[PDB]
C-alpha cells in the first residue's frame, strides 16, 4: 500500500489522494505542501559595502622631504607633496616656504555599516529543497512535519513514513552568481572578489566582515592640499555600494519566474510552484480500517446541482447515497478534473449528502470514488463573475 503519487509542486492547497489498498477500507490523503523552501548550496565569496576613506593624519615635515612607503593597508594611497605653507591656528608654522613638505596618506577601510548594511555575493549551486508538509491524515487528522525532496528520505513525524521527490522541475530561481542585501536578493553577475572596478559594484571586496584584508579598487587618488593649508584631498569614487542602492536592479522576489519568495535567512526561495513531485507514503496499517466495517455505498446516484466552472469550491453535487451500514466514507475523484473540499462524508442508512468541488471542463465527467464505489457525476457548469483574490484550488486546466 506504499502509495506512490506524482504530485504537482504548488504550495497552498491540499492534494487529497486516496489509498486504494486491496483488502481493507481505503483512506484519503490530504497533502498540503505548505512550503517549498529551497536552500541551495552556496558560498560566501565576499561581503561588500561602501568604503570609508579613514585618512591617517598626514605628515608635515617643515624643511625637506619625507619619502612615503607603500604600507600594506588596503588600497594604501600615499603621495608626498611639497610646496606648502600650512596655515594651522597661527598662520603657517613651518618656517621654510618650498621645503615645507606634506605627505598625505589614505587607505580604504570597511565602514561601520559594512558589518550590518552590506551587500553579499555568493556562488550558488543547487542544494536540496524542503517543506513543512501538513497532512491532516485519514482519521489521524494531524502531522505538520519538515521534510526533504531527495527521493529516499523519510520523515517519521506523526505516524506515517513519507518519501518525496526528487522533483523534476530543477529551476533554481537563483542564478549561479547572486548578490544579497538585507532581504532583497539580486541574481547579479557580481564581478568577483579581488577585481571590482572602482565605482562599479564591489569596489570594496572583503571576504567577510572580520576579514582585515580586502580588495579596494576605489581609484583613490590624493591631491595636494591648497594654498598652504592642512587638509587631505582624497579624490575617490563614491562606492559601488552607494550606487547599487539607487541605480540597482530589481529583486528576485520581484522578478523571479515560476512563483518564489525569498529570505535573508537560510537563503531559501520559498513556495516555488513548478512541476511535479513523485511522492510516496507508507501509512501505518493500524490507521487503516478493514473493509468489512465501512458501509458499502453502491446502488447510489450522483448529480451536480449548481456546478460553478471555477477555482473556489463552487461546484456542488448531491449524491443519493445507498449505504449498507452507517458511518463515514472517504471520497475522492481519481480523475484530476474535479478537486473536492470534503475528504470524508458521514452517512446514515442510505441518505444523501452534497459535497463541494471545483472543475475546469464545462462538462465535468469525473468519477467519484465514495469508499469503494465509483460514479460519474456528469453535468454542466456556470462561469463566475468576481475574480480578484489569491490562488485557486482547481489547478487542473486541460483541454476542454
Amino acid at each position: 500500500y506504499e502509495h506512490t503519487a506524482v504530485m504537482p509542486n504548488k504550495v497552498g492547497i491540499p492534494y487529497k489522494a486516496l489509498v486504494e489498498r486491496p483488502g481493507y477500507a481505503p483512506v484519503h490523503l490530504q497533502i498540503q505542501l505548505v512550503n517549498t523552501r529551497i536552500i541551495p548550496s552556496t558560498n560566501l565569496e565576499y561581503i561588500t559595502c561602501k568604503y570609508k576613506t579613514k585618512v591617517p593624519s598626514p605628515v608635515v615635515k617643515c624643511c625637506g622631504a619625507t619619502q612615503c612607503t607603500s604600507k600594506p593597508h588596503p588600497d594604501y594611497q600615499c603621495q608626498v607633496f611639497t610646496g606648502v605653507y600650512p596655515f594651522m591656528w597661527g598662520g603657517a608654522y613651518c618656517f621654510c616656504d618650498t621645503e615645507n613638505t606634506q605627505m598625505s596618506e589614505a587607505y580604504v577601510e570597511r565602514s561601520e555599516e559594512c558589518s550590518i548594511d552590506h551587500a553579499k555575493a555568493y556562488k550558488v549551486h543547487t542544494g536540496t529543497v524542503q517543506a513543512m508538509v501538513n497532512i491532516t491524515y485519514g482519521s489521524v487528522s494531524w502531522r505538520s512535519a519538515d521534510v526533504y525532496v531527495n527521493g529516499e528520505t523519510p520523515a517519521k513525524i506523526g505516524d506515517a513514513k513519507l518519501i518525496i521527490g526528487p522533483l523534476s522541475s530543477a529551476w533554481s530561481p537563483f542564478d549561479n552568481k547572486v548578490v544579497v542585501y538585507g532581504h532583497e536578493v539580486y541574481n547579479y553577475d557580481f564581478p568577483e572578489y579581488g577585481t571590482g572596478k572602482a565605482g562599479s559594484f564591489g569596489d570594496l571586496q572583503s571576504r567577510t566582515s572580520t576579514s582585515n584584508d580586502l580588495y579596494a579598487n576605489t581609484n583613490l587618488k590624493l591631491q595636494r592640499p591648497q594654498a598652504g593649508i592642512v587638509h587631505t584631498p582624497f579624490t575617490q569614487a563614491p562606492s559601488g555600494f552607494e550606487r547599487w542602492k539607487r541605480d540597482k536592479g530589481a529583486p528576485l522576489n520581484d522578478v523571479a519566474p515560476f512563483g518564489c519568495s525569498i529570505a535573508l535567512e537560510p537563503l531559501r526561495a520559498e513556495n516555488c510552484a513548478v512541476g511535479s513531485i513523485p511522492i510516496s507514503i507508507d501509512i501505518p496499517d493500524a490507521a487503516f480500517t478493514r473493509i468489512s466495517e465501512t458501509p458499502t455505498v453502491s446502488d447510489l446516484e450522483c448529480k451536480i446541482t449548481e456546478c460553478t466552472y471555477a477555482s473556489d469550491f463552487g461546484g456542488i453535487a448531491t449524491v443519493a447515497y445507498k449505504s449498507s451500514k452507517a458511518g463515514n466514507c472517504p471520497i475522492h475523484s481519481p480523475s484530476g478534473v474535479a478537486v473536492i473540499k470534503e475528504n470524508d462524508v458521514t452517512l446514515a442508512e442510505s441518505g444523501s449528502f452534497t459535497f463541494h468541488f471545483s472543475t475546469a471542463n464545462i462538462h465535468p465527467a469525473f468519477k467519484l470514488q465514495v469508499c469503494t464505489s465509483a460514479v460519474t457525476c456528469k453535468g454542466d457548469c456556470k462561469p463566475p463573475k468576481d475574480h480578484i483574490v489569491d490562488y485557486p484550488a482547481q489547478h487542473t486546466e486541460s483541454f476542454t
Binding site: 579613514k54 548594511d117 587638509h231
Partner: protein, 40 residues
Amino acid sequence: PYIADCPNCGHSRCDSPIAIEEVRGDAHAGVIRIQTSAMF
C-alpha cells in the same frame, strides 16, 4: 577637544574646534552621525 581647519567657517577656512569630518548621511531615519574635532 581637537581643533582642525574648518573649510568654509562662516567667512572662509578658519581653524574651528568643531571642524567637521566624517559626515555620514548613510542611514535612513533622518539621522546623521557627525564628528566634530571638539569633544563635548
